[PDB]
Design an enzyme around this catalytic site. Structure first.
Site, PDB file in Angstrom:
ATOM      1  N   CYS A   1      20.336   1.763  49.274  1.00 60.51           N
ATOM      2  CA  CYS A   1      20.302   1.135  50.579  1.00 60.51           C
ATOM      3  C   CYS A   1      18.830   0.823  50.824  1.00 60.51           C
ATOM      4  O   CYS A   1      18.195   0.272  49.918  1.00 60.51           O
ATOM      5  CB  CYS A   1      21.060   2.026  51.571  1.00 60.51           C
TER       6      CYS A   1
ATOM      7  N   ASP B   1      21.973  -0.198  59.225  1.00 59.57           N
ATOM      8  CA  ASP B   1      20.987   0.840  58.970  1.00 59.57           C
ATOM      9  C   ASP B   1      21.193   1.979  59.968  1.00 59.57           C
ATOM     10  O   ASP B   1      21.359   1.742  61.170  1.00 59.57           O
ATOM     11  CB  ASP B   1      19.585   0.231  59.120  1.00 59.57           C
TER      12      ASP B   1
ATOM     13  N   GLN C   1      22.042  10.678  56.906  1.00 63.22           N
ATOM     14  CA  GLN C   1      20.913  10.653  57.817  1.00 63.22           C
ATOM     15  C   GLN C   1      21.282  10.891  59.275  1.00 63.22           C
ATOM     16  O   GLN C   1      20.382  11.121  60.094  1.00 63.22           O
ATOM     17  CB  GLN C   1      20.196   9.311  57.667  1.00 63.22           C
TER      18      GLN C   1
ATOM     19  N   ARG D   1      23.121   5.645  54.072  1.00 66.24           N
ATOM     20  CA  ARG D   1      24.307   4.941  53.584  1.00 66.24           C
ATOM     21  C   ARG D   1      24.631   5.318  52.142  1.00 66.24           C
ATOM     22  O   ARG D   1      25.801   5.525  51.793  1.00 66.24           O
ATOM     23  CB  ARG D   1      24.087   3.424  53.721  1.00 66.24           C
ATOM     24  N   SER D   2      23.605   5.421  51.286  1.00 64.34           N
ATOM     25  CA  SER D   2      23.837   5.768  49.887  1.00 64.34           C
ATOM     26  C   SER D   2      24.453   7.152  49.755  1.00 64.34           C
ATOM     27  O   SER D   2      25.346   7.365  48.923  1.00 64.34           O
ATOM     28  CB  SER D   2      22.519   5.716  49.112  1.00 64.34           C
TER      29      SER D   2
END
EC number: 3.1.3.48
Length: 299
Positions: free
Chosen positions: A215, A181, A262, A221-222
């Protein structure tokens, strides 16, 4: 080419944070009024991650059509993705309803159910063949058919059945197990090995509905996964790596869902993955075998 020169420049000047914050400042801002309706509060995993109204996926239910999911429609690349949050205990039926209605063939899961001590995703698929799941609210049945467990990811064959019509479809589940994450994959090789496994399955074909990528929030991550795939596809259609502007592509993607990628290191990793993947696109087929060895998938 030009992206590799830019990478070296940013990386020598130590300016990934400033480059990334410039993307955040220029990113689109569109309303999310449906996501913020009181009746939908318990359909959202994160207060600050919502789909834009203009690109949200609508369920074909008359009562409440809302799911936290967005259609990223990349016009120039001619590929679409559905990015969504990790399903909640009460939205697992909605998730599979969306897969059914959108005619998706593949689901890409980039997180684990438990991360950092917290539950980041519901257990929305069956773990044992003999324990199928029925989603009573959406009238769907889901059975685990088989699974291929590698050292850091798993590919599952699922059977999804519409209990109303008794039609059945094979859904492929691509589950990346070692992508932390807010973090990056262990190497470009392990990321690319996985991405090209999804590609080789046919799940990204225009003959199917959009692949579903998630995710926990469906943005970090996506977003990294989709950005790298789209950049490689653009380069492939043109057979011209220097024609790809990664930051422009990311800003395009952010017209369809907020917050994609992110962290500055996830942006940096996206460059690394695209630069390495370009070797395959431009005709060095043997590099795919190299990634498979460097990823240590057979351990």
């Amino acid at each position: 080419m030009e992206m590799e020169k830019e990478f070296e420049q940013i990386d020598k000047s130590g300016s990934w944070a400033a480059i990334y914050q410039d993307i955040r400042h220029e990113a689109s801002d569109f309303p999310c009024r449906v996501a913020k309706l009181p009746k939908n509060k318990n359909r959202n995993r994160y207060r600050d991650v919502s789909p834009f109204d203009h690109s949200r996926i609508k369920l074909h239910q008359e009562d409440n059509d809302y799911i936290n999911a967005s259609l990223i429609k990349m016009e120039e690349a001619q590929r679409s993705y559905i990015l969504t949050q990790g399903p909640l205990p009460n939205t697992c039926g909605h998730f599979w309803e969306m897969v059914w209605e959108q005619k998706s063939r593949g689901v890409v899961m980039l997180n684990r159910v438990m991360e950092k001590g917290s539950l980041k995703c519901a257990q929305y698929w069956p773990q044992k063949e003999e324990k199928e799941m029925i989603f009573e609210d959406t009238n769907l049945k889901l059975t685990l058919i088989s699974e291929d467990i590698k050292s850091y990811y798993t590919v599952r064959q699922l059977e999804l059945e519409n209990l109303t019509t008794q039609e059945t479809r094979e859904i492929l589940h691509f589950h990346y197990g070692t992508w932390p994450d807010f973090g990056v994959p262990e190497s470009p090789a392990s990321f690319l090995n996985f991405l090209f496994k999804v590609r080789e399955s046919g799940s990204l074909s225009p003959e199917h509905g959009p692949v579903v990528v998630h995710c926990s929030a469906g943005i970090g991550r996506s977003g990294t996964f989709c950005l790298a795939d789209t950049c490689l596809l653009l380069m492939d259609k043109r057979k011209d790596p220097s024609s790809v502007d990664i930051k422009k592509v990311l800003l395009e993607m952010r017209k369809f869902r907020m917050g994609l990628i992110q962290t500055a290191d996830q942006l940096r990793f996206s460059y690394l993955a695209v630069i390495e993947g370009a070797k395959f696109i431009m005709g060095d087929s043997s590099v795919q075998d190299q990634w498979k060895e460097l990823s240590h998938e057979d351990l």
